[PDB]
Design a protein around this ligand. Structure first.
Ligand SMILES: NS(=O)(=O)c1nnc(N(Cc2cn(-c3ccccc3)nn2)Cc2cn([C@@H]3O[C@H](CO)[C@@H](O)[C@H](O)[C@H]3O)nn2)s1
Ligand SMILES: [Zn+2]
Length: 258
């Protein structure tokens, strides 16, 4: 499969190889804050990242992933809409060529400069590959980024990007603390959805934080210097690696707050 974010292989084309692209619970979506229903029955979110073990950062030609040791319950997400324990496996971002675009979710149609996805899988399914075949297999925690002041907790990520410029490159990335990427508030919206990249599997409980984090212009500028291409190939800047909002169809977005 040769999917991407260009005119000839971008989101509008994905349905040809991945028909589920036109499915009933596709992501991302627009979050209409005036339609989302406060669900007083949602439990508080439990983000338990103290024992998180980062390993490696990889440019996969679509984004970069920071990978974690998920062979044990080290870094987990519980509570909120979730039943059971979801293990952190990686995080990545989507971002734009310009500060007014880049997020995949939107809020009342507002696009943010970027969006952070912390990907977790349901341990009841034993491994990630099994989990993605289940309607409740994954929980992705989505965090918006807006351009303003620098995010100190992001800088170690920013500084290693020069070493993974092109597709297939990876670098050691141990001892990174993902807690430094969280906003103060854990207020969130939640809805059932999908992976936002092929194979677009409908296996995700989305948890999208209401409070964005601020990153500096210089920080996101360094995201934009990454390459989609591999080494020794013509340069294609890794920018605008976001899927646009998809039809909500028969889904309700629930809010953890009023
Ligand atoms: N925009 S977002 O909604 O959030 C995401 N969009 N894609 C994401 N991942 C990549 C992925 C993998 N698979 C998949 C399909 C069939 C069988 C198995 C996996 N679908 N999407 C999440 C993700 C997966 N992995 C892989 O998981 C495996 C278990 O560790 C192993 O092959 C590697 O470690 C790693 O490549 N990494 N990330 S998330
Ligand atoms: Zn993502």
């Amino acid at each position: 499969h040769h999917w991407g974010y260009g005119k000839h292989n971008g989101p509008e084309h994905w349905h040809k190889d991945f028909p589920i692209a036109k499915g009933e619970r596709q992501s991302p979506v627009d979050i209409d804050t005036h339609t989302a229903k406060y669900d007083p029955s949602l439990k508080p979110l439990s983000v338990s990242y103290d024992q998180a073990t980062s390993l490696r950062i990889l440019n996969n030609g679509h984004a970069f992933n920071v990978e974690f040791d998920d062979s044990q319950d080290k870094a987990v997400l519980k509570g909120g809409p979730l039943d059971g324990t979801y293990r952190l496996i990686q995080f990545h971002f989507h971002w734009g060529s310009l500060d007014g675009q880049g997020s995949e979710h939107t809020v009342d149609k507002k696009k943010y400069a970027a969006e952070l996805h912390l990907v977790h899988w349901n341990t009841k399914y034993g491994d990630f590959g099994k989990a993605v075949q289940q309607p409740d297999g994954l929980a992705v925690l989505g965090i918006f980024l807006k351009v303003g002041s620098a995010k100190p907790g992001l800088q170690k990520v920013v500084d290693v990007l020069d070493s993974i410029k092109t597709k297939g490159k990876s670098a050691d990335f141990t001892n990174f603390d993902p807690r430094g990427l969280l906003p103060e508030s854990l207020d969130y919206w939640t809805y059932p959805g999908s992976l936002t990249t092929p194979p677009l599997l409908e296996c995700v409980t989305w948890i999208v934080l209401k409070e964005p984090i601020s990153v500096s212009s210089e920080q996101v500028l360094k995201f934009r210097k990454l390459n989609f291409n591999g080494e020794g190939e013509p340069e294609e800047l890794m920018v605008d690696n976001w899927r646009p909002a998809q039809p909500l169809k028969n889904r309700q977005i629930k809010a953890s707050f009023k």
